[PDB]
Ligand binder design. Structure first.
Ligand SMILES: [Zn+2]
Ligand SMILES: [Zn+2]
Ligand SMILES: [Zn+2]
Length: 178
């Protein structure tokens, strides 16, 4: 097993996966690491098993059809994983916790959004469709672009959104296009 958390790259109280060499802090893993369960398989292993059980799940999909899927167990798991992939980028720190807005020449967004709020929403099963989750995720970056305007800090929103969008396309096997 690794000696650092796969998500935040720090040592600490880690839980180790029984089917691969990754380790996690308790609340870095999504869902939070389960109390008992021996053996324990992490989210990366569980996502890999889904593909192995149904190889055709990797054939290309249209984004519009993906978004309308109901949040059944396997879609729930894929959203958890995609959220996890965002938290794996160190730049996610800027978007994790509840923001505030007081900048000369800007007004705060009508609907603030942050990664820990989306984490809670998934945990409490508040999204009925994939679209719910993806809308909130995109809203995080949109709110950041609009607020920071021409400050170069707007780029952080672009950069973390690109991580989100690449992972979305990979996890949900969106049809490759030019
Ligand atoms: Zn961690
Ligand atoms: Zn694993
Ligand atoms: Zn099959």
């Amino acid at each position: 097993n690794s000696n650092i958390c796969e998500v935040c790259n720090k040592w600490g109280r880690l839980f180790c996966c029984d089917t691969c060499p990754r380790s996690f802090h308790e609340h870095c893993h999504i869902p939070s690491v389960e109390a008992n369960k021996n053996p324990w398989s992490c989210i990366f292993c569980r996502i890999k098993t889904i593909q192995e059980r149904c190889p055709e799940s990797q054939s290309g999909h249209q984004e519009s059809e993906v978004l309308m899927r109901q949040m059944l167990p396997e879609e729930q798991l894929k959203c958890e994983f995609l959220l996890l992939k965002v938290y794996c980028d160190s730049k996610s720190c800027f978007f994790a916790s509840e923001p505030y807005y007081n900048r000369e020449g800007s007004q705060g967004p009508q609907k603030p959004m942050w990664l820990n709020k989306v984490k809670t929403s998934l945990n409490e099963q508040m999204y009925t469709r994939v679209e719910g989750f993806v809308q909130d995720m995109r809203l995080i970056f949109h709110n950041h672009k609009e607020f920071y305007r021409e400050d170069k800090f707007t780029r952080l929103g672009i950069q973390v959104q690109d991580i989100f969008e690449k992972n979305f396309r990979n996890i949900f096997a969106i049809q490759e296009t030019s």
